[PDB]
Symmetry: D2
Subunit: 387 residues, 4 copies
């Protein structure tokens, strides 16, 4: 039951199942995974593809020769399995040189290095067939107010993304960029902290059509925000290029639990939205198997990611297909929300006495919205207490 297949478009970062379990207070609990073994094990589980940071695949500081041998091994595993590489990204956060950022480091020579490191991996990603290149500015930010002039930092961030856009267009690459927001951790505050801030920033770039967002469930929830609402605004703007699925229990450190864990009802409304809006991009899991687990637990946790998506998809489809739910949606006037407020125009609205002078405000106020009955039907469907 609920068996994933490649058509479900489930993808995983190499750094997810490969997380060794080292956290701020503890050493690694698992040995390092060979990327070739991860490709083969994920293929057997029914995954569609994998993603990577440059430093996940090529150990930092590798010579041009060692680099080639790592890529060839990886490519052969992809060719044997038919696994895809739909997305790639750069590690601009682990090495100590990035301790004050990559694109917005105060030191200019670090900013130039960060751009050259990124451009090198764009070339590789395009070769492997990636359609989306993700940027997570995890070190862009500050712990103290005087350390970063944020207006200058946004100038430097815009400069960097404009140069990347000039690079891909000059090379004729068919790849787009997605900014992944996070409000904090590892910096005290991170620049572009939410989906909203990232969407607003994109509109000031020279070629906005090349950039979208890669929202992550847990990151918006670290600010206490409604993740389905934020995804809806991204879809409304035409900017949902990619998505990171996982779980998070409220406002605390970034947990990266398996998808379905954390806020389960938010996961249900998210899947309802993605499916009903026809999102066609990868369903990418950015999660960490807890460091309590051995390698059997790693693959159990990865399998649970896909299983929970498929269960929620079934329940959301049954919710929307139920005639009693359709009746409830009409009782709550969800259909009237789709009607234009004033397609008759401004002047007609101003001359309409039923819109103000003769509007019966008390009769309208007395109408119940019937939202609680609708939400209990949604709860019944999620829990399988009806079909």
């Amino acid at each position: 039951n609920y068996q994933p297949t490649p058509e479900d478009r489930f993808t995983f970062g190499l750094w997810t199942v490969g997380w060794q379990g080292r956290d701020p207070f503890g050493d690694a609990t698992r040995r390092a995974l060979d990327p070739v073994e991860s490709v083969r094990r994920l293929a057997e589980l029914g995954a569609h593809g994998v993603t990577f940071h440059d430093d996940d695949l090529i150990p930092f500081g590798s010579s041009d020769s060692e680099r080639e041998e790592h890529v060839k091994r990886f490519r052969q595993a992809l060719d044997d399995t038919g696994m895809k590489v739909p997305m790639a990204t750069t590690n601009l956060f682990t090495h100590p040189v990035f301790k004050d950022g990559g694109f917005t480091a105060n030191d200019r020579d670090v900013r130039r290095y960060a751009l050259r490191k990124t451009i090198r991996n764009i070339d590789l990603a395009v070769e492997l067939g990636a359609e989306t290149y993700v940027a997570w500015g995890g070190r862009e930010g500050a712990e103290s107010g005087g350390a970063k002039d944020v207006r200058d930092a946004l100038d430097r961030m815009k400069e960097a993304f404009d140069l990347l856009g000039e690079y891909v267009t000059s090379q004729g690459y068919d790849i787009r960029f997605a900014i992944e927001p996070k409000p904090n951790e590892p910096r005290g505050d991170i620049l572009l902290p939410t989906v909203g801030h990232a969407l607003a920033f994109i509109e000031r770039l020279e070629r906005p059509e090349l950039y979208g967002v890669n929202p992550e469930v847990g990151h918006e929830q670290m600010a206490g925000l409604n993740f389905p609402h934020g995804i809806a605004q991204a879809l409304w703007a035409g900017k949902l290029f990619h998505i990171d699925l996982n779980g998070q229990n409220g406002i605390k450190y970034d947990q990266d639990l398996r998808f379905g864990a954390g806020d389960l009802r938010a996961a249900f409304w998210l899947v309802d939205l993605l499916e009903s809006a026809g999102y066609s991009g990868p369903r990418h899991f950015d999660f960490k198997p807890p460091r309590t687990e051995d390698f059997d637990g790693v693959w159990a946790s990865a399998a649970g990611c896909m299983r929970n998506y498929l269960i929620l998809k079934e329940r959301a489809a049954a919710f929307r297909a139920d005639p009693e739910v359709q009746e409830a949606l009409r009782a709550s006037r969800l259909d009237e929300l789709a009607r234009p407020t004033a397609a008759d125009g401004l002047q007609a609205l101003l001359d309409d006495r039923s819109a103000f002078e003769e509007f019966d405000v008390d009769a309208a106020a007395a109408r119940g919205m019937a939202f609680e009955r609708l939400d209990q039907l949604a709860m019944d469907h999620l829990l399988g207490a009806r079909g």
Copy 2:
């Protein structure tokens, strides 16, 4: 010491000092204030002007005749005192008819009523000299996932703001709009929950140049965000039309404490930013004197708002003027952050071996940022432990 005068541009909402103290669990503790008395008392304290919701000035449901008598009394108090009215707004949240929203209510007849109520007060605001018209969509949102299709709701929100822009341009009014974000309360989640989401939404309106943001200190802090950082992004985008100053102690209900209370160091960095960027709009206080206070406490709390701004302005100016702080800023390379990363261009950057092939990553990584010394100089200046 620290005496406010009208040139300091301090303004107050009628609903602030006039808050009667009724909260979700308690009845009012103060009698209602006559708006004329508030104008005169605020003028004596050194305020520059006042702001209002329509329903603060004209009791809801007033006839056209009673409406005129309320406005004339108010105008005469303004004329006697020289007090200005730089901003006005609509109450689309108190009356039960708005229980599911104004512009994004599911019921279409409510949405049309909300627009007509708003347009009526724009006319009045322009007559009184307001330059900014604020919209706080406090009822736009939901408690449950099925109650609101957020994509349709954003269509309805865009429709409403586009119609308001068509109205002001057809009337030839010199007034601009500012959206005030809030993440939650009184709805479970509110649409456009942060400065970022509001900035992104503005870019999809038909005439974006007419719209900016009115961020409030406490509202961004209800999402755990850095308020100075968010203000910096608004300034970077050219969209800081107005601002609401108050205090908030972390992630909880909207406290609306007097400015300076709450996160004191964030208040310092905010004033540093506003003054150094040359913000020239009103310094508006959206605060509630706690319901523990009598009327003497109301005016003490209002006076403290202005006093704390003036103290922080002095400390921030002394911080920036100190040669030792200027030296510390250079030691932390704040000046290098202002330099373009690659004004030599993409091709020069790609051919620069010092940017990658011969970049000494370990030497760069070993440089300390000296951020802690800089921040302790900032602390010393805030506390007056140096000048």
Copy 3:
């Protein structure tokens, strides 16, 4: 399906279904309910009983004669229906006289009034058959640091509860007290803000055996705490006298959603714990039907409270009864957690070389905990994707 009956011990406050919908930013959306009608409607829904504040039943300031007529009407409705009154409480938060608290008001005459108001309602509660008397100190606290000496306030709080204990013991009443914690709202910070703080305070009272806690789901979640964990500590201490069930979406204002809404997985683990520990007290719902709803929505929301408890009870029972889950619990060594660490004693432990000198730390470290497989079985059971 999932029909509640009186044996399920579901109870409701008069103030829950009777909430008129007035919130900090809006007027009431529903008319006031007659307490007699609430008793009859709740009886028809299958509820076991009702609870009340004094001021819910007797309008504040009622003469001794009017008081009697309100009580007689209420008693007759209870007698007609067989409905029970298992708990009562005092309103020490609505009237402006309590704006700085009841038991810990700075003014001594207010503290004496608060005790006399409480004692009067204890007499009534005992007459009606209440077994638990709840105290929620919603106004005990402060917005600013200098307003309240917290050590003196705790002296005054201990004094008040000791006097109440002396009163009930001198009257020979068979009633116990339960303190209901809340971290904030309506005060900036409330004294005894969590279950832990309340449990610790009880141990300093003169007769600790008379006092326990009444934890509320949403209140502990307003501090980001794990509500099942806190309930477990209360059960471990023998102090879970009563419980308030509802829902809350994270760290924000007190939402009081219907039970099952909010954190659904926390609701599942809560019901699992209550049932497996054999909690025998009332399942009391302290919730507010959203002000979007008319009276049909009020009773739908109340019915959903009980329905969701009954569904979760079924799923938790099926989880614990599943042989595959029992196997998983053994694989994760939940049974070894029940074994004493050192029943052989301190000296035996010190002389045991297998406990340190010859302990194979690397072999033990390599054991996986198999927690993810167990949690996915729990998810499958919650969602009805197995039985």
Copy 4:
């Protein structure tokens, strides 16, 4: 100005200035410090003493011979400088064997190992003169609901602490235990998550007089709680054995900023409380110099910890000594809060018609508390805008 000396009782953990800067997303940015160099550098800065985990001083897995050489080097540095060791603790969180906890690991052999590792370091701590032994149960907890039966885990936690108490009493040691709470990180939820929960747990131990709390500023603030209020309850109970001073910006990952950073006004009210209550224990800094800093920044950050305490102490003393503040405290009736509510007794209170029957509730309700004027005097004193 504000020069620390040993009489100020400032202490530092070896792990604080010695933090190498490795965080969940990045490698170390600083080389390891020799504990002997830390002792000498801290002595030169004016510190009173140092603290340590066992594994800070003796590398894990050291032979009995290597162990002796590490201790002798350390002791000689203490003897040369006169530096004290007032507190020690155990590392039960870094090694992978503790991935599910120490005292509450599901595996019984791990729990026995954790006790033997702790007991070994108690012996060493007593030899070096420690008066307090701290326990931070950082791995005691869970990421998922089924992984930990919390009632059994509390049984195991009580068993462990009872055995430690039996050990110290059988050895005749003059050392007490302090539990350090934290709500989360690195586990999803940690057992005993706040000061309140820890105080309540202590009361169920066999010898409660041996145990107190070691609260940390940032940890209580990770739950959004008022740290001065929690310290006040700990002092009221007689249980403040030790304290961890640092800074934290709201609800997020554990930042461990230098003291004074984070919530500056909470730091002021904390110092006011500690000094006015006559706390005589160490002022211990548990902080991490940000990984942006080199070694000069490490010692600047450590110096700032002590400087900020000394500045706040001066401002709080001036606040309390100001006759205008004393007048304000009387106007807010802080002195009436110290008066017993009913020293005349229960029967006198019941027969007092002025306490209820003839209490003028409206006159009492009309009294303002004058809290805002008092708080602005506190703000003026903190900022040095009066003396």
